[PDB]
Amino acid sequence: EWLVLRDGCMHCDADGLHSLSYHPALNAILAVTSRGTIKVIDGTSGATLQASALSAKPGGQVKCQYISAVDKVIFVDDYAVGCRKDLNGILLLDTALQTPVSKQDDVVQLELPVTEAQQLLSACLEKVDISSTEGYDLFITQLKDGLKNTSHETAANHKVAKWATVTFHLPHHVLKSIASAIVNELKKINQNVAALPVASSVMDRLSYLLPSARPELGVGPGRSVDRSLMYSEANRR
Amino acid sequence: PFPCLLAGGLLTYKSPATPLVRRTLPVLLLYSIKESDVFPKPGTLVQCLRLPKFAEEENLCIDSITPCADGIHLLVGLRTCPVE
Amino acid sequence: SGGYLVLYKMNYATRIVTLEEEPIKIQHIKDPQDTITSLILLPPDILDNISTLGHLVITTQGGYVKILDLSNFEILAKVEPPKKEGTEEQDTFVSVIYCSGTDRLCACTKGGELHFLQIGGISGVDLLVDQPFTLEILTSLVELTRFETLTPRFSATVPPCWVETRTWKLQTDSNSWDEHVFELVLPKACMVGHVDFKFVLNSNITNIPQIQVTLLKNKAPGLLRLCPFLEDHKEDILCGPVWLASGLDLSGHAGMLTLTSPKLVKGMAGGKYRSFLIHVKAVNESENLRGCDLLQEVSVTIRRFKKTSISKERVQRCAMLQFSEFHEKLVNTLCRKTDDGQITEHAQSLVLDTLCWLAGVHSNGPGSSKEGNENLLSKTRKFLSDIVRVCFFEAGR
């Protein structure tokens, strides 16, 4: 007879649990509820790190799995399959299963960390003047409200602060123009602030989200390459 | 050693009763993955393993496929397939 | 039926990965309520704290958790599902995963609860002191003295003010300028040699900051005065407390610290400790950076003791620490008073290697009883003239 020791229980969700996933890199229990929401729980104290709806279609049957050999989390809904990995210690699961859009006007959900959002707000309020850019006031309002809401959770717990994200439900073209404007404004003023890599990453991510915004890679002798789109590391490799 | 895709499939077919009767049988289908640089083409079956008779008599379906940590043994979990 | 467990054989006969038709093992789940929903395989080395194929944990349809040897699928461990709070209804376990942080099986219930299941629950040694000073045993001691580099990489997290064998650059953040905690986890439980702490300071520094760094044993979760944070964890200190001045270079912009202690090896002798904490505070009696903010760059690397061919090296390494009369015999070897032949330059060199080893390990003693140190220093000063004579006058370079 093998001996098993019981030492208590903790309460994860009230809707019930069907599938599970553990992320060894982050010690995060990616518990999957039967309603599709994923509760990320810290594995050192028993506190839920975050709750995410994965941006998937409502009513879908999601199934989350983790692969330690490749260290990647695979989410399979009833329509599409997505792959995710940790960025800066947190899993960006807010847009884990987001379907790629087909047009620039289609609204895309965009998730950002707290520090990146703070740097973007500081640049846009002190060092960057992009008031002429489309959707600038809406982006500023969303950034300010997200930061003032996130600061309350930031002052309480550090791990919850890092897992907390700011979500912008904004059109793809608006986000591309705002990110490009931030990049250009930071380039002309020659200020090396943390908002520039964030804006470049955001613009490249939005471009990757749109298959229609993919000019062919012209790798050949005697032909120059458009550096502004080429800023992505994937194009370089 | 080209990589292979092993899919656990359930075959339903109409067979005479000894009116057509729908029979369910689970099999393992092993396909080639790596493209050529007579090796089998990708998307073409390489091996069709047949599960033993207790899978078809009880109308079982392949629940889970899990290779063992040894690398020489394979574990297959089966369960009763619901009837439409 | 509750399902079937079929153990097949990997086929490497040809150049293409195929499978064998004949199954090695066929297992039948007689109980319908024991229908398999999820399974996880436990590596056998966890229990090390026909060749065995590990153990399998499966969740049943009725919520029972079964742990079975993979070789024969025999029910070795049985865990009934818990009762839902406020009623007698079964809180049936649905899916099971393994939590390495808690070393437990984490399983989810029907009611959304998460449960954890725990698995598992000096004399008579040949010391390295009583034997005489023959060349072979001294060579074995020297081979035990050696260190090896840890490979592959490790896991460690730092406060966000630092931005990345690893290095991190510091950003001017005063959110946590006072206290700084660097948490590290060993990749595997093996013999802990020491850790190297490299720092670079500001280029315009004219006066040395009064900043201290202290290694600490990270506490296992429950199942001139030091700063209050260090005082809270004072009972589990494992190095220092040493100041910044112990390793500054000539320029003042660089430095070095080797962190280790006899208490460190004496406490790993139990073979339980796997995570550590680095605690950094600035102690007080343009960018006016004070103490911790004044640091520019930090680099950390961890070494291990060399794994020799002599087993149970824990007690061997703790022998000289616990029995200090050995050092007295060594100073006798230094004096060449001993009549067991004439001591050659090779044996004397190994003696000095052992002496430098013990001086280096004991160089950072946190609250340790200095009685052994007092005895070895007394044996030194008692024969100090003789040892300096035989080393600097009657010996080579």
C4 to B71: CB separation less than 8 angstroms, yes or no: no
Residue C3 and residue C58 in contact, taking contact as beta carbons nearer than 8 Å: no
- Tell me the C-alpha distance between A126 and C75, whole Å: 67
A88 contacts: CB under 8 Å, gap ≥ 6: A113, A162
Using the Cβ of A12 and the Cβ atoms of chain C, whether some distance falls under 8 Å is answered with yes
Q: How far is it between the farthest Cα atoms of chain B?
A: 50
Resolution in angstrom units: 7.2
d(C-alpha C9, C-alpha C11), whole Å = 6
Helix (H) or strand (E) holding B25: strand B21-32
> What is the least distance, in Å, from the CA of C334 to any CA of chain B?
55
Q: Burial-class residue C103 by CB neighbours within 10 Å (0-12, 13-18, 19+).
A: middle
DSSP type of residue C216: E
Rounded Cα distance between C121 and C292, Å, is 44
- For residue C211, give the amino acid letter: I
What tokens does C114 get?
A: 């998460």
Q: Which residues of B touch C10 (CB under 8 A)?
A: 67, 71-74
Q: Verify whether the Cβ–Cβ distance C108 to A20 is below 8 Å.
A: yes
Q: Which pair of structure tokens corresponds to residue B52?
A: 């033993």
- All residues of chain A having their beta carbon less than 8 Å from the beta carbon of residue C118 are 4-7
CA C149 to chain centre: 14
Compute CA A216 distance to the chain's CA centroid, rounded to the nearest angstrom.
26
Distance CA C120, CA C46 (A): 9
| Residue in chain C lying closest to A11 (CA) | C113
The torsion defined by the Cα of C146, C150, C151 and C156, in degrees rounded to 10, comes to 180
- Residues in A closer than 8 angstroms to C95, CB to CB, are 17-20
Strand intervals (E) in chain A: 4-11, 17-19, 22-23, 28-33, 38-42, 48-52, 63-67, 72-76, 81-84, 86-87, 90-91, 107-112, 166-171
Name which of C7, C11, C17, C48 to mutate to probe chain B: the one with the most chain B Cβ atoms within 10 A of its Cβ.
C17
CB contact under 8 A, A21 and C97: yes
CB C276 within 8 A of CB C215: yes
Nearest residue of B to residue C37, measured between CA atoms: B63
Which residue, among C365, C198, C376, C362, has the nearest Cα to C278 in the 3D structure? C198
Total CB pairs under 8 A between chain B and C: 100
A15 contact residues in C (CB cutoff 8 A)? 112
Q: What is the CA radius of gyration of chain A?
A: 20
Q: A9 Cβ partners below 8 Å, 6+ apart?
A: C82, C113, C114, C115, C116
CB within 8 A of C310, min separation 6: which ones?
C140, C144, C316
Rounded to an integer, what distance in angstroms lies between the CA atom of residue C373 and that of residue C381?
Answer: 12
CA gap C248, C232 in Å, rounded: 29
Residue closest to C41 by CA, chosen among C60, C59, C57: C57
Residue C2 Cα, gap to closest chain B Cα (Å): 6
A161: nearest CA partner in chain C:
C160
Residues in C touching A9 (Cβ below 8 Å): 82, 113-116
On chain A, the residues whose CB falls within 8 A of the CB of C109 are 17
For residues C19 and C96, give the distance between their C-alpha atoms in angstroms, rounded to a whole number.
28
C-beta atoms of C115 and A4 within 8 A: no
C–A contact (≥3 CB pairs within 8 Å)? yes
E-strand stretches of A155-217? 166-171
- Let me know: does A216 contact A229? Beta carbons within 8 Å: no
Q: What are the percentages of helix, strand and coil residues in chain C, rounded to 5?
A: 25, 30, 45
Asked whether C177 and C162 are in contact (CB, 8 A), the reply is: no
| Dihedral in degrees, nearest 10, Cα atoms C119, C122, C128, C129 | 160
DSSP C196: E
What is the rounded CA–CA span in Å between residue C221 and residue C118? 14
| Nearest CB to B72 within list C9, C23, C43 | C9
Strand partners, A221: none
Long-range contact set of residues A91-95: C-beta below 8 Å, sequence gap at least 24: A91/A23, A91/A26, A91/A28, A91/A30, A91/A40, A92/A165, A93/A30, A93/A38, A93/A40, A93/A50, A93/A52, A93/A54, A94/A52, A94/A53, A94/A54, A94/A55, A94/A165, A94/A167, A95/A54, A95/A55
CB contact under 8 A, C115 and A29: no
DSSP C343: P
Cβ neighbors of C131 (< 8 A, separation 6 or more) are C137
Closest CA to C225 of C175, C283, C181, C279: C283
Q: Å from C9 to nearest chain B CA?
A: 5
Q: Which of A172, A237, A178, A181 is nearest to A208 (CA)?
A: A172
Strands (E), chain C: 4-11, 18-19, 25-28, 38-42, 55-59, 65-69, 75-79, 93-99, 104-109, 113-119, 147-149, 155-157, 162-163, 166-170, 179-185, 192-201, 211-217, 257-259, 275-282, 295-305
Are residues B54 and C3, on separate chains, in Cβ contact within 8 Å? no
Give me the amino acid identity at A170.
L
- Report how far residue A170's alpha carbon sits from residue A209's, in angstroms, rounded to the nearest whole number: 13
Distance of CA A82 to the CA centre of its chain: 13
- Cα angle C74-C75-C79, degrees, rounded to a multiple of 5: 165
If you measure CA to CA, which chain A residue comes closest to C63? A18
Rounded-to-integer distance, Cα A178 and Cα A139, Å: 8
Q: What is the DSSP annotation of C63-110?
A: S-EEEEETTT--EEEEEPPPBPTTS--B--EEEEEEETTTTEEEEEET
- Among the listed residues A79, A72, A67, A71, the one whose alpha carbon sits nearest the alpha carbon of residue A36: A79
Asked whether the beta carbons of C216 and C233 are under 8 A apart, the reply is yes
Chain A: touching chains (3 or more CB pairs < 8 Å): C
Q: How many CB atoms lie within 10 A of CB A237?
A: 5
Residues of C in contact with A115 (CB under 8 A): 160
